[PDB]
Amino acid sequence: AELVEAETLAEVNAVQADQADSIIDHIVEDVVAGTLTDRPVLVMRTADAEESDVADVSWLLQQAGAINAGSITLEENFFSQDGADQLKSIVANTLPAGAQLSETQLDPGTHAGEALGAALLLNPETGEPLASTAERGLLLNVLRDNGYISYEDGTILPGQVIVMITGDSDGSGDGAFAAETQSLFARALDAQGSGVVVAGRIHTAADTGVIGRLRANPDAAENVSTIDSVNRTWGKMATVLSVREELA
Ligand SMILES: [Ca+2]
């Protein structure tokens, strides 16, 4: 008799599921579709980012008409104390021409963001790439060879906006250094023009989390868009809308 109740459960919830998909389809068409036509957007993802969050945001960017400028995974060593010294050395030795590392802020996030920003972004006033294809390949390959980043060969293009998708870390315990370095990294990318959207799950909005740190700084809160609920439907939509805000 238990096959009857499983049948009613499927009947009741299949109606609810179809209703939810219809709502979401309508939202995509009215909010996201066609809003980023021919705009190159690059996606960065931290090591602890949920793959569903990254795949969902990447799908919505494609639905908006954005050009897939590449997906770059920032491995654990990218934001760890252990890897700070070698990361600063790599970005210094492969620094593209026309890029200058900060002489007052010597943290790995600022330097890595200044170097990667020049390698991956377009001049927001002229549209020209900030670095040559050879300079971009050098930095990306040296970073990848040393285990700092992961990406697929020949899929990276210079973009107008970077969407960094983070995890669900509140910046407590040993996650503190990474959370702070991520915020300085995001501000450095934004300081190279163009535009940055940082998206994470709710715990990143803690005062010690990456988004909490960004929002607490008046300059960063005005310059870097932050989405604290990227695992929610409207959080994904707000991320895509924020890309168009950063472009304006
Ligand atoms: Ca900005």
Numbering used by the authors: 46 to 293
Text of the article:
In the order Corynebacteriales, which includes the important pathogens Mycobacterium tuberculosis and Corynebacterium diphtheriae, the most important murein hydrolase for cell separation is the endopeptidase RipA. We present here the crystal structure of a full-length RipA homologue from Corynebacterium glutamicum, Cg1735, which reveals an unusual mode of autoinhibition. We describe how this autoinhibition is relieved by the conserved transmembrane protein Cg1604 and propose an FtsEX-independent model for septal control of PG hydrolysis via the Cg1604–Cg1735 complex. In this model, two septal TM proteins, Cg1603, with a cytoplasmic N-terminal globular core, and Cg1604, with a C-terminal globular core exposed to the cell envelope, form a signaling complex that couples intracellular cell division events with PG hydrolysis during the last stages of cell separation.
